């Protein structure tokens, strides 16, 4: 079965599945957990950085696209770089040609279309990385989840990566609560950390191991690492 | 149009087409090179699957890249022509822009790079060739000897050999070449060279050509006799015991 239909993305299985895409999705699960949640004033990205050795660094998982947009990654870093760089251009083309900030919803559409092209043609491979995009635009705070299959969904909160289901449950529970953490970023960030810890097990989030990003009403997307996040551990 | 990845990785971390390229070199006729204190010698053996040729016009094994550098090889003859032409051209180009002929390391690094490129480019197979490049840098007298292989790797040797039974002749050279006292003479260097070949040539007066390269574009190829005289003086070193 599967073995005869997972050679490349251009092939459909007898049941209508695209295994190469499914396999790509698998790279995400094997990726370090990251969380995303928003109120009506802010959107937060809390990402657990993973280290190779104890002599290594905890690889960056948060990238800024524009002053009002950024995302967290789970999966193949190179693919996140490619996709983030593409987003940086679309966000940039919008400002230059139209003097308009790109709507978060529209950036999701672009990512979906770029990802899709890599699932219908021979020779290419799907992207192997999941992305959580947060932003503040002309319609408020926004959180998006990107899947290599090309599926992009807008949520109040979510998480991707290993054990990500912990955090996701916590959020689907804490919903009514954090959605109202307006005008108070530190409270949203804390909620973000309490969510990402629901997917811990190995260790405990440390200073050089924690990474957080915030954006909103009067807050240009900015990233905090180490010391700057000590007051959240 | 044709860009199939022919050279790729297999589970154990190998690139079989490069590995098989080497098997083609093992099959080529043995080649050797030893550097004296003021010269370098290149020796090649002559096959005999068919004999009734015309030695005048049949392509020789040692090729001049420029007046001060020569290149010998082991493996696919046709493949070696391609590398030689590219090196001869790169030699002129270097002279035309740097206003100075290539060093032997530069010319080697070039051939090597060309070989590496064919190991990770679509639509092409690696060169079934390994080379020994030798000569003297411009205005320098210190001898130079390098070797390249299908993978694109290269390095310099005091003495080296490639081709069939190169396994055997290398051993000879390892317990017959002293870095402390390299063949201080063109003559004793040419002898040490023929000796190592006789280990595998099996009586081959017409099956052993030797080329001697000295500083300042001084390159010359010995005649059957000149070499034949070396073999004779060597067969006596043995019998006289």
């Amino acid at each position: 079965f599967r073995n005869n239909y997972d050679g490349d993305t251009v092939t459909f299985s007898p049941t209508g599945r695209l295994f190469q895409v499914e396999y790509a999705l698998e790279a995400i699960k094997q990726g370090s957990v990251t969380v995303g949640l928003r109120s009506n004033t802010h959107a937060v990205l809390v990402a657990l950085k993973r280290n190779a050795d104890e002599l290594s660094s905890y690889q960056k998982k948060i990238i800024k696209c524009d002053e009002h947009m950024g995302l967290s990654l789970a999966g193949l870093a190179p693919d996140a770089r490619v996709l983030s760089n593409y987003l940086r251009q679309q966000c940039n083309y919008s400002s230059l040609v139209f003097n308009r900030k790109l709507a978060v919803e529209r950036a999701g559409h672009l990512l979906c279309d770029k990802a899709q092209k890599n699932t219908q043609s021979y020779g290419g491979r799907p992207y192997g990385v999941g992305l959580l995009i947060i932003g503040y635009d002309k319609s408020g705070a926004h959180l998006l989840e990107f899947q290599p299959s090309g599926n992009v969904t807008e949520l109040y909160g979510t998480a991707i990566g290993a054990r990500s289901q912990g955090a996701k449950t916590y959020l689907e529970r804490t919903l009514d609560t954090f959605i109202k953490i307006d005008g108070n970023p530190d409270e949203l960030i804390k909620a973000g950390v309490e969510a990402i810890s629901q997917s811990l097990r190995d260790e405990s989030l440390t200073v050089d191991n924690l990474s957080i990003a915030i954006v909103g009403k009067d807050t240009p997307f900015t990233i905090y690492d180490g010391e700057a996040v000590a007051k959240y551990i | 149009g044709y860009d199939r990845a022919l050279s790729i990785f297999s589970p154990d971390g190998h690139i079989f087409q490069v590995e098989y390229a080497l098997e083609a070199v093992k099959r080529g006729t043995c080649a050797v090179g030893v550097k004296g204190k003021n010269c370098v010698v290149l020796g090649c053996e002559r096959r005999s699957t068919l004999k009734l040729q015309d030695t005048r016009i049949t392509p020789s094994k040692v090729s001049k890249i420029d007046s001060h550098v020569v290149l010998s090889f082991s493996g696919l003859n046709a493949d070696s022509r391609i590398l030689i032409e590219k090196a001869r051209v790169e030699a002129q180009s270097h002279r035309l822009t740097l206003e100075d002929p290539v060093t032997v390391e530069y010319l080697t690094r070039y051939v090597a790079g060309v070989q590496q490129r064919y190991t990770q480019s679509g639509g092409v197979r690696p060169f079934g060739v390994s080379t020994l490049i030798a000569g003297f840098d411009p205005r320098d007298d210190e001898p130079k000897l390098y070797q390249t292989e299908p993978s694109g790797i290269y390095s310099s040797w005091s003495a080296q050999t490639i081709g069939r039974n190169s396994k055997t002749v290398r051993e000879f050279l390892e317990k017959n070449y002293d870095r402390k006292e390299p063949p201080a003479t063109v003559e004793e260097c040419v002898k040490l060279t023929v000796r190592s070949l006789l280990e595998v040539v099996q009586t081959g007066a017409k099956n052993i050509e030797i080329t001697v390269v000295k500083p300042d574009s001084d390159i010359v190829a010995l005649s059957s006799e000149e070499i034949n005289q070396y073999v004779t003086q060597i067969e006596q070193e043995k019998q006289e015991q």
Binding site: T15, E105, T153, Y156 | -
Partner: protein, 244 residues
């Protein structure tokens, strides 16, 4: 022998093209969506499974507009659907640019047809993983169409595809018989909301979110618009009521 199903443009001994047939499986495995042609327009509707409470309601829109008078909804691999609309949008711009008049629905349908059919000619590409329902109002009436992964398409009175295509196709056949005089835009909107609630049983496990859009010469002026607020709620009710 076998293997006839591993390459896309290959004919099996029985004259079929298995990869296309497999793509269809992907279409049947998707959400259900429909199209109801009416006396002066067409109505589109689709099922939106609420995976979780985390999904922002009313946000992840699925129905798509092409030019200003055409509506498109599809079931199957969503990304493939967007890819097809993008093509259709270019296809439309091109036509208007040269001929000035916005593109006729029949002409637009062939554009998508030829393009989709194209992806069943080479083994270097994959067939589309969606069935698309689209249509609009033009110089001579309203038109409803459904395009299959094979590039096949026809004009319909009503159409459905996806998980509950049978429930829908059933409900649609009824309407066709009990309304030879033709449904109305206003009526088709409620009717649609119902066909969707019924066809949801073939997925009754997960909660959903309804989406409707319509293009009526009288209700929208021949332009495609989404049903929102009151008119939407009125339809959800009409459905939630007759579901009991």
């Amino acid at each position: 022998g076998t293997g006839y199903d591993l390459s896309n443009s290959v004919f099996s001994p029985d004259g079929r093209n298995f990869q296309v047939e497999y793509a269809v499986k992907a279409v049947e495995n998707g959400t259900t969506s429909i199209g109801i042609k009416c006396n002066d327009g067409v109505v589109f509707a689709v099922e939106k499974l609420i995976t979780s409470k985390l999904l922002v309601p009313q946000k992840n829109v699925k129905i798509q507009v092409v030019d200003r008078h055409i509506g498109c909804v599809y079931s199957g691999l969503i990304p493939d659907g967007r890819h097809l609309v993008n093509r259709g949008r270019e296809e439309a711009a091109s036509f208007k640019k040269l001929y000035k008049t916005p593109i006729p629905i029949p002409a637009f349908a062939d554009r998508l047809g030829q393009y989709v059919q194209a992806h069943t000619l080479y083994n270097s590409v994959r067939p589309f993983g969606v069935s698309t329902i689209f249509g609009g109002v033009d110089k001579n009436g309203a038109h409803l169409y459904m395009l299959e992964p094979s590039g096949s398409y026809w004009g319909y009175k009503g159409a459905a595809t996806g998980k509950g295509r049978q429930s829908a196709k059933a409900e649609l056949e009824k309407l066709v018989d009990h309304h030879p005089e033709g449904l109305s835009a206003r009526e088709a909107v409620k009717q649609a909301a119902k066909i969707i609630y019924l066809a949801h049983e073939d997925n009754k496990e997960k909660d959903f979110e309804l989406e409707i859009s319509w293009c009526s010469l009288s209700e929208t002026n021949g332009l495609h618009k989404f049903v929102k607020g009151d008119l939407l709620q009125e339809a959800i009710d009409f459905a939630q009521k007759e579901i009991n």
